[PDB]
Amino acid sequence: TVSLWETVQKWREYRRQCQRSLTEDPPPATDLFCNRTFDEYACWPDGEPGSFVNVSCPWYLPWASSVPQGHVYRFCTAEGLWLQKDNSSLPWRDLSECEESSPEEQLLFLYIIYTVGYALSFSALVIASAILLGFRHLHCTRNYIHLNLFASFILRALSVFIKDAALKWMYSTAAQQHQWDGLLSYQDSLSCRLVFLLMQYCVAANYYWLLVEGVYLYTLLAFSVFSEQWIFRLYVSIGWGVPLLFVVPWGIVKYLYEDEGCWTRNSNMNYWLIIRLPILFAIGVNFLIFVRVICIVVSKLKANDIKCRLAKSTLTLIPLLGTHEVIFAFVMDEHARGTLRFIKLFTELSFTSFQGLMVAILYCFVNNEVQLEFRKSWERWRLE
């Protein structure tokens, strides 16, 4: 859709021919006439005194095309001057014919929810990461995967806080006044684009560490025994490096063909598929892993109240793999409209923001091993 930069270009274009009109056009050759002027909105040709002055809707307006038969009118009389507004100096003007032509609150509701969610997930995970790192007895491949998952959640939350601030700095009073003057703004800056490139990598990295969590847990249960060192190298490589294989091409394509708006607006949805599809692949595979693990869990419980234990297991396993995404993941952006779009965004934003908090609680705070460490550390210090 039309942009602020494209609008100021047309208005500054509009001023150029109008200033030519104020000079190139011949004089009316009639005295006692309302003089031609140009306000910042409309170019006013001079008119004969005693009747209306007809000028069409300015064409730099985004909605000018929607009102082809629009005409700004102005009235001057044999007094030789325009009639000013009552108790005002500026001349009278009627612009209803060329007049300007909640998503805000719902998105405010949404912004508040995930900002609170990400903040609480961020706070709990740095505490939880210290706990796993602090106790040497908790150092194992499982907790190493968890720590990398905590980092991916923490980086994702941080990238969101920086992303939100960048949108504010891009639409500030100064930024607007600078793009109005034609001066360079934060939007032109390359730091603006890497901020939203950072969001794309951090979100994708978090999704791929949820994938690694499932793949690692799958290998333990598939009974597939491997060189535990090479395994880990491949896992860190996938969690942090595989997203680079599709995020960098997205930035390259954005920089060459859609380098506008600080890489924020998904104008061409094919280019936005460069990041979405690999994330959908991680979500779908991790959902198959989710099914196969619950199928393993039910077989174990059948051998030795299946439901309450299966529920505890299913509910605690959901945040570790992010399986709440599969509900609306296959509902693409191109087709989510109206209340469907809000509900899709609300679940995705709200559940994922608190997912880090969930993971920090279910895999560090309620963890029996972690609780054993604080009990014995309390016992050890009690012996002093």
Binding site: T1, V2, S3, L4, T7, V8, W11, D39, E40, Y41, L61, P62, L90, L95, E100, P103, E104, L107, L110, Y111, Y114, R156, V160, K163, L167, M170, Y171, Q176, Q179, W180, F196, M199, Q200, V203, A204, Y207, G261, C262, T264, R265, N266, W272, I275, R276, I279, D333, K344, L345, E348, L349, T352
Partner: peptide
Amino acid sequence: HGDGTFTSDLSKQMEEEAVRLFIEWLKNGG
């Protein structure tokens, strides 16, 4: 993902508000 879709929708909403403010400024003789 939801973060990218939320940010895209918010930037289009803000962009149109800045566009409207620029026109709302002109009528004030800026």
